[PDB]
Amino acid sequence: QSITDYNYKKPLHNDYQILDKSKIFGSNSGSFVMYSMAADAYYIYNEKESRKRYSPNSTYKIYLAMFGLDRHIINDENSRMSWNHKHYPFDAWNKEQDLNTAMQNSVVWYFERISDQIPKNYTATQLKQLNYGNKNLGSYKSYWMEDSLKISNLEQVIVFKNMMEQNNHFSKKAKNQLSSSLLIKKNEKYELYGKTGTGIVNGKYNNGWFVGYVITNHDKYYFATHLSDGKPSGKNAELISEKILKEMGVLN
Secondary structure (H helix, E strand, O other), X not given: XXXXXXXXXXXXXXXXXXXXXXXXXXXXXXXXXXXXXXXXXXXXXXXXXXOEEEOOHXXXXXXXXXXXXXXXXXXXXXXXXXXXXXOOOOOOOOOOEOHHHXXXXXXXXXXXXXXXXXXXHHHHHXXXXXXXXXXXXXXXXOOXXXXXXXXXXXXXXXXXXXXXXXXXXXXXXXXXXXXXXXXXXXXXXXXXXXXXXEEEEOOEEEEEEEEEEEEEOOOEEEEEEEEEEOOOOHHHHHHHHHHHHHHHOOOO
């Protein structure tokens, strides 16, 4: 909308290190950002591109889940939602869901059902308090899917880290329930948490994301990969994230 809606310009008041992950990105274009809790420092590949704001797509379901927990639309004893009986192209969508199943399978109707129960003034208050990208709700429909709401790769890390780590009005059990829903991988060395996001425009991928965090025995790292061209899917952004986190020593 405004002159500032496509770009995040706020200086990092933080130690930062510039990375060169161009070989892993290959023919794809985009950025990678990681923050380390113990180091209090940002590691950035393609810093200019990390500040360009893009639709978050399904990565915003992180925030819809938090808001649905905070408003008690879903809880710990019940996060179940019955299927309304409409046929979707994937059978994982064609049944009852809980937060865990819906997050894992990016089941759109679950999160759309949550968003419809949340009043616009709450969301606006939340995006303001969280500094969530351009904060632009537009028509307030599926405003996070190739629509008015945009956020940069750098802000994806900053905002997620601050939401989880600051003592805010989001309770600790809601944060824990969100985390369980986002867990992808756990072994002796680490726990990897995250959420893909994929934008499709005219049958073509236009926008790929993977936003999350890693807990090791020694540190906690928030990260995000955004793809803007080449093959910009969430699945590709996830693959790129894993190669970079592994090269950086985060996964061992």
